[PDB]
Amino acid sequence: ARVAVLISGTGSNLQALIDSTREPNSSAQIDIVISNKAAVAGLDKAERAGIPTRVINHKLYKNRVEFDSAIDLVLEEFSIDIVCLAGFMRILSGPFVQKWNGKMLNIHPSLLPSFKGSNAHEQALETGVTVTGCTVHFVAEDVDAGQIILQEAVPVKRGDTVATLSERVKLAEHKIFPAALQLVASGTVQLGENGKICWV
């Protein structure tokens, strides 16, 4: 399977994905990295890895739909089968999400359905959980609500800050995100006709 990775920043999970796809028994290859912001560290990572990059500034379009159409133009250009969101920070429109249904994954730094939204660590710490984690899920229209592929629990330590908890959760993300990509890329895991996660 041919894979695109969309980023908005440092692309924390990008290298783990790259390394995974370059192992001998890989079902996936990363063919392009697309960022909605220029000069982010994730682009430098992609450039160092020898992977083509594009920058598509969301601020240059009047709505989500036109911006997403510009993304999908590039995805078609590169014959992409699978989209991975690695710290991509723009909510995608219905039509884009619909077209890429069963073919687009996201990493979220909580055990969904807890702590939906972009500040999961802050929420976890305010709530006072002693266990949090990360989730790889298919992207659905509803934000952070798509079908769960894999999860990993991560302890919260007394005295944790967003920075320390974030680092601990990132280590787990580096494990489950490439594992989930491989599961989808190969025959192994599919979004079913009933809308549920199916292990073929």
UniProtKB/Swiss-Prot annotation:
It comes from the Eukaryota. Residues 3-200 are annotated as: GART domain. The record marks D144 as: Raises pKa of active site His. The active site is at H108 (proton donor). (6R)-10-formyltetrahydrofolate binds at R64, M89, R90, I91, L92, N106, A140, E141, D142, V143, D144. N(1)-(5-phospho-beta-D-ribosyl)glycinamide binds at G11, S12, N13, K170, L171, A172, E173. Homodimer. The N-terminal ATP-grasp domain carries the phosphoribosylamine--glycine ligase activity. The central AIRS domain carries the phosphoribosylformylglycinamidine cyclo-ligase activity. In the N-terminal section; belongs to the GARS family. Trifunctional enzyme that catalyzes three distinct reactions as part of the 'de novo' inosine monophosphate biosynthetic pathway. This is Trifunctional purine biosynthetic protein adenosine-3. It comes from Homo sapiens. The chain holds residues 808 to 1007 of 1010 of the full protein.
